[PDB]
Amino acid sequence: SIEDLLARKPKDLDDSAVAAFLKDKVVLVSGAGGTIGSELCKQCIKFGAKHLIMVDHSEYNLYKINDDLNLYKEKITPILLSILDKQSLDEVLKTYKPELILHAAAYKHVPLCEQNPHSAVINNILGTKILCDSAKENKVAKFVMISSDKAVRPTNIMGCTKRVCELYTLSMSDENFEVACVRFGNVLGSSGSVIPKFKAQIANNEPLTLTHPDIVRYFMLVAEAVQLVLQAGAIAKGGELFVLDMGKPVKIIDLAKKMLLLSNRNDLEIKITGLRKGEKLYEELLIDENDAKTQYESIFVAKNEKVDLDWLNKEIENLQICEDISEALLKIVPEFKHNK
Amino acid sequence: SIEDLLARKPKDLDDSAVAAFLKDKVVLVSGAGGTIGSELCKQCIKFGAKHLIMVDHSEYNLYKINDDLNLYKEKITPILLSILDKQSLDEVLKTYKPELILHAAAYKHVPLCEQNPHSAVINNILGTKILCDSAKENKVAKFVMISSDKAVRPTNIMGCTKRVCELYTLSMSDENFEVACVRFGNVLGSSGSVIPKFKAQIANNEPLTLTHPDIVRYFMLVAEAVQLVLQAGAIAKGGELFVLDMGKPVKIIDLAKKMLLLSNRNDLEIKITGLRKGEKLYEELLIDENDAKTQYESIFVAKNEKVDLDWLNKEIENLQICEDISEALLKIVPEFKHN
Numbered sequence: 149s150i151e152d153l154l155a156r157k158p159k160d161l162d163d164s165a166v167a168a169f170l171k172d173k174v175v176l177v178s179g180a181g182g183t184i185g186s187e188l189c190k191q192c193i194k195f196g197a198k199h200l201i202m203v204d205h206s207e208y209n210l211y212k213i214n215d216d217l218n219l220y221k222e223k224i225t226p227i228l229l230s231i232l233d234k235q236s237l238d239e240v241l242k243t244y245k246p247e248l249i250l251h252a253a254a255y256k257h258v259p260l261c262e263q264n265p266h267s268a269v270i271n272n273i274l275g276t277k278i279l280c281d282s283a284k285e286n287k288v289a290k291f292v293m294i295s296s297d298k299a300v301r302p303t304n305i306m307g308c309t310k311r312v313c314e315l316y317t318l319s320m321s322d323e324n325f326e327v328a329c330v331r332f333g334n335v336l337g338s339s340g341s342v343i344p345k346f347k348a349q350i351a352n353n354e355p356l357t358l359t360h361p362d363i364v365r366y367f368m369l370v371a372e373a374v375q376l377v378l379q380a381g382a383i384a385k386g387g388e389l390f391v392l393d394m395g396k397p398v399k400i401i402d403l404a405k406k407m408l409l410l411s412n413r414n415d416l417e418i419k420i421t422g423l424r425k426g427e428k429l430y431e432e433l434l435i436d437e438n439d440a441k442t443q444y445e446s447i448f449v450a451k452n453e454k455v456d457l458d459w460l461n462k463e464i465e466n467l468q469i470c471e472d473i474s475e476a477l478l479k480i481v482p483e484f485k486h487n488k
Numbered sequence: 489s490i491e492d493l494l495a496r497k498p499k500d501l502d503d504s505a506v507a508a509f510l511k512d513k514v515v516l517v518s519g520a521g522g523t524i525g526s527e528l529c530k531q532c533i534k535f536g537a538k539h540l541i542m543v544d545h546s547e548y549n550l551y552k553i554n555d556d557l558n559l560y561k562e563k564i565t566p567i568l569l570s571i572l573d574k575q576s577l578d579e580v581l582k583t584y585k586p587e588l589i590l591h592a593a594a595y596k597h598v599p600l601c602e603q604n605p606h607s608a609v610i611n612n613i614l615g616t617k618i619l620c621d622s623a624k625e626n627k628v629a630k631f632v633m634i635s636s637d638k639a640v641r642p643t644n645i646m647g648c649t650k651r652v653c654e655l656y657t658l659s660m661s662d663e664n665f666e667v668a669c670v671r672f673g674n675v676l677g678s679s680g681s682v683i684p685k686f687k688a689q690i691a692n693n694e695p696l697t698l699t700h701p702d703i704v705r706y707f708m709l710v711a712e713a714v715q716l717v718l719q720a721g722a723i724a725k726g727g728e729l730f731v732l733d734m735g736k737p738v739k740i741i742d743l744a745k746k747m748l749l750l751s752n753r754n755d756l757e758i759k760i761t762g763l764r765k766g767e768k769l770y771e772e773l774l775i776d777e778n779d780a781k782t783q784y785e786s787i788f789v790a791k792n793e794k795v796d797l798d799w800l801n802k803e804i805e806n807l808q809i810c811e812d813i814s815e816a817l818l819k820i821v822p823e824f825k826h827n
């Protein structure tokens with residue numbers, strides 16, 4: 149399949165390192181039923197977590213990961229909950245006392261977030277603030293947030309909200325509460341992504357819709373990305389912004405063309421539809437030449453400075469009441485260049 | 489297919505009646521990306537709505553229905569929102585001024601709601617209260633809520649929450665704000681349901697897991713149930729609790745056996761796993777012999793009395809903070825017999 153062809157096959161996957169990090173821990177995964185969250189759940193079981201707390205606001209998604217892990221039902225707890233509900237979230241943290249939170253709950257679709265920028269701010273920034281604050285207050289030892297190459301020099305509301313989340317979480321890290329963020333690019337076959345869209349077009353004998361002939365993304369298999377996230381969490385001392393080596397860029401036109409060749413469906417045309425608001429032709433390359441090496445060739449540490457939380461909390465209040473969210477986000481993230 | 493065999497094929501589908509009800513309306517669908525919500529969206533387009541406002545808190549589900557309807561993109565607005573967010577929901581209603589709300593946003597899984605009863609109360613009862621209140625304040629003309637046979641003499645948290653939602657919405661109905669609730673049974677192949685589960689077990693060479701050899705449900709195709717919901721909505725004058733004729737009961741063991749037969753995997757076993765907390769062996773038959781007929785053989789009107797809204801609002805405030813949710817629900821719904 150094209151998945152196999154575009155897998156990274158990282159040479160530095162380290163099962164025993166992840167087992168050492170997770171064995172007998174109580175771990176809470178937010179967004180547990182999502183593409184990334186579900187794989188985080190599966191790997192928590194694989195690598196020996198004692199008790200997995202699965203938090204998701206989407207009932208089908210929660211149902212499905214809980215069903216997927218039914219052989220391990222005695223050590224998993226499905227919590228149907230939005231992380232915006234601080235009071236209920238606090239009760240969950242007190243009840244189960246997780247030692248690690250893996251935070252994979254967010255809205256990620258660039259077009260939808262352009263159309264719903266207030267909801268993007270509330271779900272992404274306020275949700276992350278509530279979950280991180282509750283974690284620190286309830287003495288969770290370590291907190292790892294999933295981030296995106298879209299957070300790097302963002303051109304869209306979504307990516308900018310994720311950058312604010314990096315700033316907030318990293319600024320909360322201290323010697324009692326270790327936070328790390330891990331940035332990576334596209335996961336092959338993820339919810340609502342290009343590969344399932346192309347599959348559904350080819351099945352239904354429809355032309356493939358390509359945004360631009362030159363567009364490029366970086367790709368990894370979900371199991372590869374998630375295990376590297378966990379390796380990064382395992383080595384983190386707190387305050388690190390990690391970045392993954394995604395390998396070679398893939399032109400989406402070559403992706404489309406290969407899917408057609410593999411489906412034996414060269415009868416179909418590829419139609420160009422146009423670059424959408426907020427959308428990059430080439431996402432940013434994640435690893436900077438001055439980033440720090442780790443013991444894993446696929447994982448580097450990027451520079452980040454803490455911001456003052458009094459300032460950032462005030463800006464996060466402003467985001468909730470302001471007339472112009474794009475303008476308000478630019479106050480927090482000076483590198484934001486909104487592609488309207 | 490198993491779906492074809494169990495379809496109701498109601499003889500009283502009426503496309504022109506639904507078109508007359510929906511043509512050139514601004515319609516908002518809550519839960520727009522869900523199994524029922526998505527079909528409501530599709531039918532709103534089919535039957536001539538001017539503008540469809542799609543509200544859903546699940547990004548993939550919203551993404552998917554918006555994509556499914558991409559040929560109609562100029563007439564649809566995807567709103568990524570929980571109906572619990574009153575301030576933002578009010579802004580949406582004030583902006584788009586829908587004349588009809590079709591309310592299909594809820595949590596429905598009986599086991600998950602037994603395990604998360606506070607979330608079932610908040611999402612189902614408070615969400616419905618927020619949406620219904622906002623609708624009435626923003627002069628929405630008509631409000632139609634999807635309900636369930638699980639709401640009838642409920643034995644589980646989920647179904648009891650739905651019954652409270654009926655009582656609330658129907659009690660809000662008045663001369664200017666017409667409410668209808670429509671009860672029906674299982675939709676064939678809905679999200680997270682038995683047919684997809686059995687398909688996945690067969691595909692992975694696994695025994696089918698059957699709750700109880702005698703268990704039965706009533707079934708309809710989603711397009712059938714939704715079109716009948718819309719016919720009921722069209723005829724509603726306000727205050728009606730409608731029920732659909734689901735046809736004959738289906739034993740889930742027969743469903744399981746037919747799926748094995750249809751897949752030529754009679755090699756697979758059917759394992760009995762047991763009745764779950766809150767679960768009924770036979771759901772209630774929806775049509776009572778004293779229900780009123782309508783012009784559609786498939787739609788009847790059940791008796792319902794309004795409750796005092798001051799009392800019910802107080803009870804709903806308590807449900808949000810109480811430790812004894814099962815007991816508290818029993819005070820609101822005296823017919824609740826929690827299994």
Ligand SMILES: NC(=O)c1ccc[n+]([C@@H]2O[C@H](COP(=O)([O-])OP(=O)(O)OC[C@H]3O[C@@H](n4cnc5c(N)ncnc54)[C@H](O)[C@@H]3O)[C@@H](O)[C@H]2O)c1
Nearest residue numbers: 179181182183184204205206230231253254334335338339
């Ligand atoms: N999919 C990718 O290619 C990719 C790549 C790199 C980074 N990421 C990042 O990973 C994160 C998740 O991506 P995904 O692909 O898993 O998306 P997803 O939508 O499949 O998963 C997110 C999950 O979080 C849940 N959720 C959302 N908001 C919530 C809330 N308030 N409370 C509780 N649960 C909530 C959702 O229901 C869903 O199950 C995003 O921030 C995204 O930018 C994704």
Ligand SMILES: NC(=O)c1ccc[n+]([C@@H]2O[C@H](COP(=O)([O-])OP(=O)(O)OC[C@H]3O[C@@H](n4cnc5c(N)ncnc54)[C@H](O)[C@@H]3O)[C@@H](O)[C@H]2O)c1
Nearest residue numbers: 519521522523524544545546570571593594674675678679
């Ligand atoms: N067999 C059936 O599926 C069936 C039969 C009869 C009645 N019903 C009733 O119909 C309703 C929906 O069932 P379904 O099968 O479509 O379930 P579903 O989970 O597929 O759809 C519900 C949709 O509502 C959304 N949603 C949930 N809470 C929300 C919130 N607070 N704000 C915004 N969006 C929200 C979800 O994301 C989802 O897309 C439930 O009350 C159910 O009991 C279902």
Ligand SMILES: O=c1ccn([C@@H]2O[C@H](COP(=O)(O)OP(=O)(O)O)[C@@H](O)[C@H]2O)c(=O)[nH]1
Nearest residue numbers: 340341342343345357358359363364365400
């Ligand atoms: O119908 C589509 C959907 C996506 N893409 C492109 O494929 C890549 C991956 O898009 P996806 O939605 O999968 O994720 P994103 O990169 O926005 O997170 C991007 O370059 C898109 O422009 C495309 O050509 N056609």
Ligand SMILES: O=c1ccn([C@@H]2O[C@H](COP(=O)(O)OP(=O)(O)O)[C@@H](O)[C@H]2O)c(=O)[nH]1
Nearest residue numbers: 598680681682685697698699703704705740
């Ligand atoms: O793995 C399963 C799942 C469901 N059921 C039964 O199938 C029927 C339909 O269950 P579903 O989850 O589809 O919907 P529900 O009736 O709970 O809304 C009920 O009698 C369930 O007990 C079953 O026997 N095995």
Ligand code: NA
Nearest residue numbers: 183186212216
């Ligand atoms: Na999966």
Ligand code: NA
Nearest residue numbers: 221222224225
């Ligand atoms: Na469990």
Ligand code: NA
Nearest residue numbers: 502503504505
């Ligand atoms: Na007709």
Ligand code: NA
Nearest residue numbers: 523526552556
């Ligand atoms: Na569908």
